[PDB]
Amino acid sequence: AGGGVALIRVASKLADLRGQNEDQNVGIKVALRAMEAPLRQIVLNCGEEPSVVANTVKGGDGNYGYNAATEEYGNMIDMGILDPTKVTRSALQYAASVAGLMITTECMVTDLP
Amino acid sequence: AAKDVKFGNDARVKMLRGVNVLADAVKVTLGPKGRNVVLDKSFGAPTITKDGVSVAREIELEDKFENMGAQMVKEVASKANDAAGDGTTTATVLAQAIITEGLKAVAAGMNPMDLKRGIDKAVTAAVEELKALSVPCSDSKAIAQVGTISANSDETVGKLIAEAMDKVGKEGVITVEDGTGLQDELDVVEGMQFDRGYLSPYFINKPETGAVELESPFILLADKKISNIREMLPVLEAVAKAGKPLLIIAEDVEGEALATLVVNTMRGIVKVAAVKAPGFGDRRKAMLQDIATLTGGTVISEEIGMELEKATLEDLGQAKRVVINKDTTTIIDGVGEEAAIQGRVAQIRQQIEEATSDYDREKLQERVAKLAGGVAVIKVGAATEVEMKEKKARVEDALHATRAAVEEGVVAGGGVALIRVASKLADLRGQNEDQNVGIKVALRAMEAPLRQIVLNCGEEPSVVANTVKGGDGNYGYNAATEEYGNMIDMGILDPTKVTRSALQYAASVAGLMITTECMVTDLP
Amino acid sequence: AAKDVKFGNDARVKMLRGVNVLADAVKVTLGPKGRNVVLDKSFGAPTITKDGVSVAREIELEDKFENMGAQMVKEVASKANDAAGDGTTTATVLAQAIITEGLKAVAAGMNPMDLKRGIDKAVTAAVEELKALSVPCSDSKAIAQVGTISANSDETVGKLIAEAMDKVGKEGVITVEDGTGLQDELDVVEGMQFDRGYLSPYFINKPETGAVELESPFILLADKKISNIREMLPVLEAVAKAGKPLLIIAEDVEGEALATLVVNTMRGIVKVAAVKAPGFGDRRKAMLQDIATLTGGTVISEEIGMELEKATLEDLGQAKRVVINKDTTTIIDGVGEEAAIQGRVAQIRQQIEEATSDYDREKLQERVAKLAGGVAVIKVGAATEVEMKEKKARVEDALHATRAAVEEGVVAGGGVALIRVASKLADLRGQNEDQNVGIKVALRAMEAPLRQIVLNCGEEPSVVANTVKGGDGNYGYNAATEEYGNMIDMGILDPTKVTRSALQYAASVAGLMITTECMVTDLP
Amino acid sequence: AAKDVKFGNDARVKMLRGVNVLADAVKVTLGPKGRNVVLDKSFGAPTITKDGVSVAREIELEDKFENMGAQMVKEVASKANDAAGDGTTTATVLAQAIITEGLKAVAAGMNPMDLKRGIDKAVTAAVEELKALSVPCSDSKAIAQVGTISANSDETVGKLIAEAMDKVGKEGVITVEDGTGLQDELDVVEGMQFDRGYLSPYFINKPETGAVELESPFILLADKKISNIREMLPVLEAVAKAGKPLLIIAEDVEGEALATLVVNTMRGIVKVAAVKAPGFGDRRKAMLQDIATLTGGTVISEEIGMELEKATLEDLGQAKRVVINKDTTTIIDGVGEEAAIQGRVAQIRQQIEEATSDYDREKLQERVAKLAGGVAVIKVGAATEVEMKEKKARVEDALHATRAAVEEGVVAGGGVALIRVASKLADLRGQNEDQNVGIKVALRAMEAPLRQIVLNCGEEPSVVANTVKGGDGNYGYNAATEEYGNMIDMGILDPTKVTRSALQYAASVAGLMITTECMVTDLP
């Protein structure tokens, strides 16, 4: 289900995930909120309320989501808002990789201005 | 002196900056989960309070234009608080929301006068909707419930308020006093209360409550306007050598008389409070005569023959305790003959019997009610002096809230009445598009306070607001328990008068600010 | 006046800076190996002290907001010191740790209200754990041991306090006076103590202890709120010509009377201390009558008829010595006929035996206990005057420490009680993640004081902290000997009251500062 | 390299400043009473112009953001000019009005997407209203009228264009070039015009007129694409030894052949052009065969087995005069036997009456009409060169305006059509309120050009605009004569195409700029 609702559905499913350490739990919550973010950005571009739409989509299940183009909810597959699973998976994995590399960054070397 | 003048957009921008500063200072203390503001004191120990009234009182900005905007918002909030007993923070945040949206519209090119018309129409419709949504508080059960709610769910204050309003009536005068013993005491004593207050604010005996209180004071009654002090210099000297304070009420006190009264008050040698006589003309003279009988004194009338130099300590009226406030003055348990009061009530009621005009009948009925009903005194008793003072303050707050409730009922508190009303007024339209924009501005502004409360609670404002708007009636969001349902059952009650006054005063100040085009103020 | 307003992050950072400055100033004086702080003086000779109370007393910063935060921490630390007698530095460092960690968590994006909830829950659990860990100090041997420990391992002071308490009772009143001979002297004299303090600090005769002492003073007994000076002017003149000190106890002292009393104290012509009457109402009248009988004087009452003008020296109350502090006032050896004392105590006992209600019975029982117990005066003696002053200071410090011990027991001192309680509470949980993080913050803050002490000792903080954590019971690290063991047996004791009060006040101030969102202060 | 970014409001205000500078520079020349704009050239003599095209070309801002906003409005205005033939100033002022009002609305808080939707809806309705209001231009008298007023009220051009349209229909091909004598003569020659121009702007012989003009060209007709020079250099050497210009007609010219032909053109050894073959597939080959028959030459096609190497002068196409523009070219007097044209039109004719698919049916109609219609050339003569060149410019502008009027019609000029359409579209509404705001913005923006014209005329524009709105039909205000009436009767008129294109492109650029949130540009 495209339009950034696959990530919010996955985050809703994974809201019960846990880690070995409290910092791992904080990281999991960070990842879930980040997964929430793209749909919020889309509906902010649409001019609607981000949090209300995000919570409404979270309440639903399956491929039910908010259609940005028509500003009306329902099954995202039927209206034709399809994003390939590979696209979303690769985007999420690469964003996670770059963010993990950047969070652990401690030092830099650059040419002086 | 030289003045700095701003025109058009710049003045409104400065005004918006000032209002935003004041509203952000006072708005974090809204709701049960409201934050606290730390106020600096010259002594050294800062004061940390969750009361928005003190935060608004302490706010004053360096920039003149922003300072004046903040002062106007402060003045309207204080007027709302005095009229209703609460809602300073609610009035300020409502005003800020209306102001921001209206100034945005004005910058868009909207007509300020049409915007003000739309705001006024929407607020009038909101007042009508609030009156429709209110529930009566006539039965003693609801009175006790409201009194309990006001003082942090304490049943004791509720039953004391309920029994006081049963003994004296919903329209009677109820005053609190320190309890000698542990058990709370309620007694009814003769007395009256009028709407006239002190001439200048400095006569306040206790700055914490902003009111004037006297123990066993003398009562002075003059039928002429007091301007000269030499006339009653012997009277004040006799009062000072007697020891007991003196309360003077006449047509007016001003000039050198008021100046020397302030001098005596600030020096502390003589503590005397001045309050204008109630009413005007024949009604004023009749009320003065009634007060003379109540306190056992004599009215100093120039035309009759008595004069201030001729007044002696015997002529002065006497009471055991009086309370003076800028909005009203209370006389409690004045030493006077009960037979004299019986004669006065008999002559007033026969005057009513022979009266013809409706206005005179109503005024005489008000006089006889305020003369014969008396004052119901609540003696708040506890086990410790500090907890006695705390309980007295809580009882006074509960009494004010219950008075507002019995005057106008109670709506669902916690800022959900405003959002319910704004949801009910979705179809309101004006005669102009600018009026419709103003109406939408007013609706969003009424939405705002609940959003601010739930933002202080840390939850999402928009989701909670939409969930509350989805419901109907008194259904809303509870801030303390973070769970929805009926607000009346959970005890989150705000008097309809408080919300109505806050909304109306916020609308008035917002309209005055939107229709503002220029200033005059002193240079830095 | 114009005000400078800070919102959210900036205000919290300013408070963090101020608290950090004050805490770094005061924390270097923690522990036996604590450093010392140099304090400037206008005279020229700097004051070098290892006492954190003074270091806090002369902290005040140039930045208004940092000064506000530092003054909040100073006020709560002073409240802890007054309530307990010690723990100013511990409370300050605990507050700094909680504030720093809580501000970090708030900047992380979490709800401050849930953080404060978690802090309060963890601190309540810590108080319960401290109550569980405390050992009784009721018998004479533990009392003497605690007194010895408090007075720098001096057995004479501890044992003297031991028999003083055994003679007067653990709840009895004990005062310290200068002795004449070398040998210490203990005696019991008739007297009583009440918690009514002085009106203003301007009456403090000796600033080093912050108390008021009068040798052979005259006690005024008035049943009315002192407001006018002309009433007791003849009494003041008679006392001045007598030359003995004067003391007033009444319902309240305010206005020109208080102003002229302060003026006279500054001039020194007449030494007068202003103290309110104990209790309120009929109970206050009863306590005033008890004091009158104790001093042999007569109560000047409005209902009797005689006034302050008609008062005479022989009707005026007299005592050998009185001590006045902001928290309490003590009457020592009031000159009164013993027959009247036994008559009054007998009539109090028959009132008790005829009393019915539990509250009145308890009030009369405490009244008779304080009336009949008397005052056990301690006359500390030494060969040299300066060493006798030092011994008196040690005796009074040991007296406060032993009072705290007998009130709430003793725990393993040196900051290891907090780390043991944190080890016990490491399994605590809250209703939300923010509450859990707040509990962790509170536990780490409780860890902090031992780390600071061992850092002052120069050893490794974390290693010693974890080594003490691995232990159980009162096992802990000794700062002086740099080797572990049972803290109780090694002579390092802190009263449970001191630690509990320090932790509670640090938690309260930290929650108030974490929930702070806005400020109002005067511009530079 | 490194780039500076602006977001949200700052980007919009920068773009607004740039568009404001552009519009204030270009709109002062709007209307018959337009002001003068002086422009520098590095040569030494400033130029003074009253046309908006030159000012728009010469204008740009030093700051990158304002600059790029100016160039985007400039490029949409240039697109409007290229499509319609005029209207750069009207399109630019319309764009400025929409942009200003829409950015004000966006700053007010309305959603930019809904604003763009409303603007687009209003503009589509305006296009429909303009189509309804358009007066058809098909009569020869209407052709004379549009040619006259379009050429500064010069009627001779009106009649000349009239018999041009009479000879070669309304949709035929009409051209004007330099001529001899005093009289103006018209002749029709066998020719056509397809929509292919030069592949590179460096092939141009007459940069002043922007046309690759060749006198007696000798064209090449190669069906295959030309990349290198080996197979096509025999043609170059043949035309070099024959001394005739070469033109190139091919499916697509690429490789270094284009570069070397441009180089040889620069050196002046031989003039060589390059024009694409219109269409693609087999239709392009068929119409290339048609061109070969028209010019009497042979097509070089790889499908028929022959190649470009053996292309010689005797078996290749030739023409008398060809004008190559950027988008289309005109072949004039294709030399060749008329029997070839007769055979070709016959073959195309049976292609019509045995055509199966409709689309191909209309395609064959246009092909046969284009081939058999011919090209009409008009010859302009006068006394000296300067006035006949001025007449050349006037005739070219009149011909373009006549073509536009024939294509879409004639509406009232001077912005009367826009104000009339805006008045007629007063009740348009959208789905959302922001859409209605955008519709009102578009209506006021299309009101604006007439107001600007009146302001240039010296009169205040509000009264004139309301007076013209009060009227109906083509009634409007004549700026030149300072009076009202039927705008067509006074003759001041413009083609419907110009107004429609100006409105469309102004709306497009305004929506694009309204929806802009981020701007990326190089650092200063």
Class in CATH terms, D135-190+372-409: alpha beta
d(CA C342, CA D266): 135
Find chain D residues with C-beta within 8 A of A46's C-beta. 113
d(CA D448, CA D455): 10
- Residue D232 carries which side chain, given as an amino acid letter? M
- Chains contacting D (3 or more CB pairs within 8 Å): A, B
Rg (CA), chain C: 25
Q: Quick one: which of B362, B344, B402, B348 has its CA closest to B168?
A: B402
Residue C66 sits at the vertex; the CA angle it makes with C61 and C69, to the nearest 5 degrees, is 110
Tell how many helices (H) and how many strands (E) occur in chain A. Answer: 5, 2
Three-state DSSP class for residue A64:
strand
Write out the binding residues of B: 29-32, 50, 86-90, 414, 478-480, 494
> What are the residues whose beta carbons fall under 8 Å from the beta carbon of A59, sequence distance 6 or more?
none
Write out the binding residues of C for ATP: 29-32, 50, 86-90, 414, 478-480, 494
d(CA D189, CA D175): 11
Q: Quick one: which of A46, A50, A69, A70 has its CA closest to A8?
A: A50
- 10 Å Cβ neighbour count for C384? 9
Three-state DSSP class for residue C326:
coil
Would you call D104 exposed, middle or buried from its count of C-beta atoms within 10 A (0-12, 13-18, 19+)? middle
DSSP H or E segment with residue C382: none
From residue D409, alpha-carbon distances to B125, D403, D499 in Å are: 54, 9, 11
> What are the residues whose beta carbons fall under 8 Å from the beta carbon of D223, sequence distance 6 or more?
D250, D251, D277, D285, D288, D299, D300, D301, D302, D303
> What are the residues whose beta carbons fall under 8 Å from the beta carbon of A47, sequence distance 6 or more?
D111, D113, D114
Q: Kindly write down the DSSP assignment for every residue of B362-413, as one continuous string.
A: HHHHHHHHHHHS-EEEEEE--SSHHHHHHHHHHHHHHHHHHHHHHHH-EEET
> What are the residues whose beta carbons fall under 8 Å from the beta carbon of C310, sequence distance 6 or more?
none
Tell how many helices (H) and how many strands (E) occur in chain D. Answer: 18, 18
DSSP assignment, residue B428? -
b/e per residue, D58-72, with b = 16+ CB within 10 A?
Answer: ebebeebbbbbbbbb
Q: State both tokens at B308.
A: 């201030």
- Residue B174 carries which side chain, given as an amino acid letter? I
Chain A residues near any Cβ of chain B (below 8 Å): 49, 51-52, 55
- 10 Å Cβ neighbour count for B20? 17
d(CA D118, CA C490): 86
Q: What residues are paired with B318 via a beta bridge? A: B218
Alpha helices (H) in C85-139, listed in sequence order: 88-107, 112-133
DSSP H or E segment with residue B36: strand B36-39
Q: What share of chain B is helix, strand, coil (3-state, %, to 5)?
A: 55, 15, 30
- 10 Å Cβ neighbour count for C353? 9
DSSP assignment, residue C113? H
From residue B519, alpha-carbon distances to B12, B65, B158, B514 in Å are: 10, 8, 49, 13
What is the location of CATH 3.30.260.10 in chain C? 135-190+372-409
Q: Quick one: which of D418, D416, D437 has its CA closest to D428?
A: D437
- From edge to edge, which strands make up the β-sheet containing B173-178? B173-178, B375-380, B185-189
d(CA B75, CA B77): 5
DSSP assignment, residue D136? P
What is the location of CATH 1.10.560.10 in chain D? 1-134+410-524
DSSP H or E segment with residue A72: strand A72-75
Residue B521 CA, distance from chain mean position: 30
d(CA D412, CA D27): 19
Q: State both tokens at B30.
A: 């809204």
Cβ contact D114–A46 (<8 Å): no
Rg (CA), chain D: 26
DSSP assignment, residue D109? T
Long-range residue pairs from D456-465, CB within 8 A, at least 24 positions apart, any chain: D456/D28, D456/D29, D456/D30, D456/D31, D456/D33, D456/D34, D456/D35, D457/D31, D457/D32, D457/D33, D457/D482, D458/D33, D465/D419
SS (H, E, C) B441-498: HHHHHHHHHHHHHHHHCCCCHHHHHHHHHHCCCCEEEECCCCEEEEHHHHCCEEEHHH
Give backbone dihedrals phi and psi of D318, rounded to 5 degrees, phi first. -140, 155
d(CA C512, CA C506): 10
Give backbone dihedrals phi and psi of D437, rounded to 5 degrees, phi first. -60, -45
DSSP H or E segment with residue B279: none
- Residue D103 carries which side chain, given as an amino acid letter? L
Three-state DSSP class for residue B329:
strand
Count how many Cα atoms sit within 13 Å of the Cα of residue D48 in the half-sphere of its side chain.
3
Looking up tokens 């840390």, which residue turns up?
B458
d(CA B184, CA B154): 14
Looking up tokens 């065969």, which residue turns up?
D289
Cβ contact C279–B25 (<8 Å): no
> What are the residues whose beta carbons fall under 8 Å from the beta carbon of D305, sequence distance 6 or more?
none
Strands, E assignment, B283-326:
317-324
Looking up tokens 């009145």, which residue turns up?
C360
Three-state DSSP class for residue A5:
helix
Find chain B residues with C-beta within 8 A of C279's C-beta. 385
d(CA B68, CA B518): 12
DSSP assignment, residue D295? H
- Residue B247 carries which side chain, given as an amino acid letter? L
Task: Report yes or no: C272 and C195 within 8 Å, Cβ to Cβ.
Answer: no
Alpha helices (H) in B85-197, listed in sequence order: 88-107, 112-133, 140-150, 155-168
Would you call C386 exposed, middle or buried from its count of C-beta atoms within 10 A (0-12, 13-18, 19+)? exposed
Q: State both tokens at A59.
A: 């309440």
Task: Report yes or no: C177 and C200 within 8 Å, Cβ to Cβ.
Answer: no
Q: Which pairing describes strands C493-495 and B521-522: parallel, antiparallel, or unpaired?
A: unpaired
Q: Find the farthest-apart pair of alpha carbons in chain D and give their distance in angstroms, rounded.
A: 75
What is the location of CATH 3.50.7.10 in chain C? 191-371
Check the CA dihedral C262-C264-C268-C274 and report its sign. Answer: negative
Q: State both tokens at C41.
A: 């003086």
d(CA D224, CA D252): 8
- Residue D138 carries which side chain, given as an amino acid letter? S
Q: State both tokens at B64.
A: 């003149």
Would you call D195 exposed, middle or buried from its count of C-beta atoms within 10 A (0-12, 13-18, 19+)? exposed
Task: Report yes or no: B402 and B165 within 8 Å, Cβ to Cβ.
Answer: yes
d(CA D30, CA D448): 12
Q: What residues are paired with C135 via a beta bridge? A: C410
d(CA B218, CA B247): 6
Looking up tokens 């006190």, which residue turns up?
B253
d(CA D448, CA D32): 16
Q: Quick one: which of C457, C467, C415 has its CA closest to C32?
A: C457
Count how many Cα atoms sit within 13 Å of the Cα of residue D403 in the half-sphere of its side chain.
16
In angstroms, the first-to-last Cα distance of chain B is: 12
Q: Quick one: which of B22, B11, B114, B14 has its CA closest to B70?
A: B22
DSSP assignment, residue C196? -
DSSP assignment, residue D29? G
Distance from CA of A79 to the nearest CA of B (A): 26
Q: What residues are paired with B275 via a beta bridge? A: B198, B249
Chain D residues near any Cβ of chain A (below 8 Å): 111, 113-114
d(CA D513, CA A8): 32
DSSP assignment, residue C35? -
From residue D190, alpha-carbon distances to D195, D343, D351 in Å are: 18, 14, 21
Q: Which pairing describes strands D249-250 and D275-276: parallel, antiparallel, or unpaired?
A: parallel
d(CA D307, CA D299): 10
Task: Report yes or no: D412 and D453 within 8 Å, Cβ to Cβ.
Answer: no
Q: Quick one: which of C26, C106, C79, C101 has its CA closest to C504?
A: C79
Resolution expressed in Å: 3.2
d(CA C408, CA C401): 11
Write out the binding residues of B for ATP: 29-32, 50, 86-90, 414, 478-480, 494
Give backbone dihedrals phi and psi of C193, rounded to 5 degrees, phi first. -130, 140
> What are the residues whose beta carbons fall under 8 Å from the beta carbon of B471, sequence distance 6 or more?
B484
Using CA coordinates, name the residue in chain A closest to B463: A52
Dihedral angle over CA of C109, C112, C118, C119, nearest 10: 120
Classify domain D191-371 at the CATH topology level: GroEL (3.50.7)
Would you call B339 exposed, middle or buried from its count of C-beta atoms within 10 A (0-12, 13-18, 19+)? exposed
Q: State both tokens at D436.
A: 């209605």
d(CA B400, CA B394): 10
- Chains contacting B (3 or more CB pairs within 8 Å): A, C, D
Interface test with B, best of C114, C518, C521, C523 (most B CBs within 10 A): C518
> After which residues is chain C discontinuous, taking C to N > 2.5 Å?
none
Task: Report yes or no: D3 and D523 within 8 Å, Cβ to Cβ.
Answer: yes
d(CA B248, CA B275): 7
Q: Quick one: which of B91, B60, B93, B94 has its CA closest to B78?
A: B91
Three-state DSSP class for residue D337:
coil
Find chain A residues with C-beta within 8 A of B462's C-beta. 49, 51-52
Q: Kindly write down the DSSP assignment for every residue of D140-176, as one continuous string.
A: HHHHHHHHHHTTTS-HHHHHHHHHHHHHHTTTSEEEE
d(CA B87, CA D56): 59
DSSP H or E segment with residue D298: none
d(CA C137, CA C129): 18
d(CA C93, CA C87): 10
- Residue D285 carries which side chain, given as an amino acid letter? K
Distance from CA of D123 to the nearest CA of A (A): 22
Task: Report yes or no: C292 and C317 within 8 Å, Cβ to Cβ.
Answer: yes
Cβ contact A49–B466 (<8 Å): yes
d(CA D458, CA D456): 5
Three-state DSSP class for residue D313:
coil
Alpha helices (H) in D268-415, listed in sequence order: 283-295, 338-353, 358-373, 385-408
- Chains contacting C (3 or more CB pairs within 8 Å): B
Q: What residues are paired with B378 via a beta bridge? A: B176, B186
Three-state DSSP class for residue C428:
coil
DSSP assignment, residue C275? E
Q: Which of the four CATH numbers 2.60.320.10, 2.60.40.2550, 3.30.559.10, 1.10.560.10 does domain C1-134+410-524 have?
A: 1.10.560.10
Q: Quick one: which of C477, C479, C461, C448 has its CA closest to C96?
A: C448
Residue D323 zone, left/alpha/beta (φ > 0; ψ -120 to 50; rest): beta
Find chain B residues with C-beta within 8 A of C68's C-beta. 38, 40, 46
Task: Report yes or no: C280 and B379 within 8 Å, Cβ to Cβ.
Answer: no
